[PDB]
Amino acid sequence: MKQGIHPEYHQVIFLDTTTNFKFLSGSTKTSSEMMEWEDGKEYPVIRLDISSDSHPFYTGRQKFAAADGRVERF
Amino acid sequence: NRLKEKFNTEVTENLMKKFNYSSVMEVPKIDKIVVNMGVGDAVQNSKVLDNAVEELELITGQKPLVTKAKKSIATFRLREGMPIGAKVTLRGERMYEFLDKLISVSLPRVRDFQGVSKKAFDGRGNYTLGVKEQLIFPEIDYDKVSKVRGMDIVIVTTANTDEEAR
Amino acid sequence: SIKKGPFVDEHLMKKVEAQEGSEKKQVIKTWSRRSTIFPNFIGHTFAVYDGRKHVPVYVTEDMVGHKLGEFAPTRTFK
Amino acid sequence: ARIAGVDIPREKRVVISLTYIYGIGTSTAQKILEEANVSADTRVKDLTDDELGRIREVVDGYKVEGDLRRETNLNIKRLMEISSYRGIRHRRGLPVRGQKTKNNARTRKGPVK
RNA sequence: UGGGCUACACACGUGCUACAAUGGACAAUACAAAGGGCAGCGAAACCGCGAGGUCAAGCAAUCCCAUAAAGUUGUUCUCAGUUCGGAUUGUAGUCUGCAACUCGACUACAUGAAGCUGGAAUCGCUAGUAAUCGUAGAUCAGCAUGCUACGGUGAAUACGUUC
Ligand SMILES: [Mg+2]
Ligand SMILES: [Mg+2]
């Protein structure tokens, strides 16, 4: 972190629909809508992700389509 | 910062009583995270691919050179990449960027890591690193991150990536 | 392709529905390339062409809903 | 621009801006445009920063997945390379469906002429 | 009985539908001719996303198929491999049939390729005429961009016989 040549980055709050569990850093900047104090009291403008709502593993998706299985009585 | 205290509350009792180490300071720490992004053009396209990685992790990024000036493409001391070390306040943060979920096509990354006890990955395009925008980038900025630990067992690398989807 | 009974030819049904008793394998001798696959089909071949072929085709658990014994082609290309 | 990967176009009508996503276009895009405060009025990249949340929560409820089921067409198709017909020897030898394989300008599956 | 006449790297005739803004989508919205229909044409109101399903009175200027369509007034996309075009390709149906795999047709669900008015050359037409969208018929259970018939909109041009 030598001076001068780097772009600046600092923390945010990523307003996810599930608990907003991201107070980490990044180069994005916009208007601080909803600040907090339990997380980084900074530019709150990190909007939304799809982090912890449906993983391909740690969740449940919809069912599979169709086998042979003539369950329609032809 | 909360990722570090989970490395200092959660994995402490686990990895010392599942792998059954003796002392307390024996768990696999996470060392450097190198990020190398080659370019297929030995002419001019790397002039526009400098800024892409700097939006994901603001370290300036070295332009490397070749060693040998090999057969049918390039002469000596061109640029074909951009390595960036990420060590402490970034390695607890870029690995904390668990938003490869934007890629979404079976985010399960790999099964076989490598024979020595490191763990290399792959990406494809503007998916990960959710700070960047999908407007000013009409080129596949695809990267190759890595993750090396002080452990000397690939079984230990299987446990240590408990919180990144495989 | 409609409702109402996917149109197995009935003499083929006459052969299979009592052919499935023992552990013997004498398959078809049909050359009727019309019928679909009833789901109660045992391991046996068929003979489904009549110009010159008895191609023994597998009854293996494919997509059985096809209204055809069309696993046996008719001609070549090259 | 959030629906599947990105929904690239701005400032169009949304009823055809939801055609650039896979699996939905121009006639079920009228149907899946089913939400209050959701109407095409030349506000594609406007008029919604929370109203967009309902019209992809329902798309996640819309059981046919859009892009997540790109494996099922090759499940069905590759299942039909068990050598029956209708995909079997239009791919294992590669002619084209269309019932006339060399009399007309069949070039939609042919490489060139 | 069951295959074939449809097969295939290819060569050429005829035909159609298109490359867009005097264009496309969208609801509303007027004016024909010539034809067929006694187990055939089928209304009205009915159940379907439509392809249609049931029943069902009227019947040869009168009854049925049978709303002609282009255009007018008006909303909208605003010059893009594009809200241009449907070529291709899986699922899920309808109908005719003893049955639609080889080998029909139609519907809505996504898929959406080639293509920017086309080299050398080459045709068709002189007023209801070429072009434009349509209407009916025989053949026929079912399946035509062909086919012979019918109306609607309707221009430009011909001084000249030299090749
Ligand atoms: Mg012939
Ligand atoms: Mg009427």
CA of B84 to C1' of E54 (A): 75
Q: By three-state DSSP, how is residue B120 classified?
A: strand
* Nucleic strand E under 7 Å from the C-beta of C55: no
Question: Could you tell me the resolution of this structure in angstroms?
Answer: 3.9
* Nucleic strand E under 7 Å from the C-beta of D19: yes
Is-contact B119 B161, C-beta < 8 A?
Answer: yes
DSSP secondary structure string, chain C?
--SS-----HHHHHHHHHHTSSS---------TT----S---S------SSS--------SS-TT-S--TTS------
- Across the interface, whether the CB atoms of B99 and A51 are under 8 A apart is answered yes
- The C-alpha of D65 sits at a distance from chain A's nearest C-alpha, in angstroms, of 9
**What does the alpha-carbon distance between residue B37 and residue B64 come to, in Å, rounded to a whole number?**
11
Sign for the CA dihedral angle at C64, C68, C71, C77 comes to negative
DSSP secondary structure string, A8-67?
P-EE-----SSTT----EES------S--SSS--S--------TTS--SSSS--PPP---
**What does the alpha-carbon distance between residue B149 and residue B33 come to, in Å, rounded to a whole number?**
10
Closest nucleotide over all strands to D73 (CA to C1') = E90
- The C-alpha of A63 sits at a distance from chain C's nearest C-alpha, in angstroms, of 20
**What does the alpha-carbon distance between residue B5 and residue A72 come to, in Å, rounded to a whole number?**
56
**What does the alpha-carbon distance between residue B64 and residue B39 come to, in Å, rounded to a whole number?**
11
Q: How many residues does chain A have?
A: 74
Is-contact B99 A48, C-beta < 8 A?
Answer: no
- Nucleotides of E strand lying within 7 Å of any protein CB atom: 1-4, 6-12, 76-78, 83, 87-95, 97-105, 108-114
β-sheet bridge partners, residue B147: B119
* Nucleic strand E under 7 Å from the C-beta of D100: yes
Task: Supply D109's token pair.
Answer: 């599956």
For the segment 16-45 of chain C, residues whose CB is within 7 A of strand E: 31-34
- Across the interface, whether the CB atoms of B104 and D5 are under 8 A apart is answered yes
**What does the alpha-carbon distance between residue B162 and residue B147 come to, in Å, rounded to a whole number?**
13
Determination approach: cryo-EM
Residue tagged 């449906």 (tokens): A54
Chain D residues within 8 A of C63 when measuring between CB atoms? 79-80, 82, 84
CA of C1 to C1' of E104 (A): 13
For residue D1, what is the nearest residue in chain B, using CA coordinates? B134
Task: Give, in degrees to the nearest 5, the angle at Cα D75 between D73 and D81.
Answer: 105
State the DSSP code for A7. P
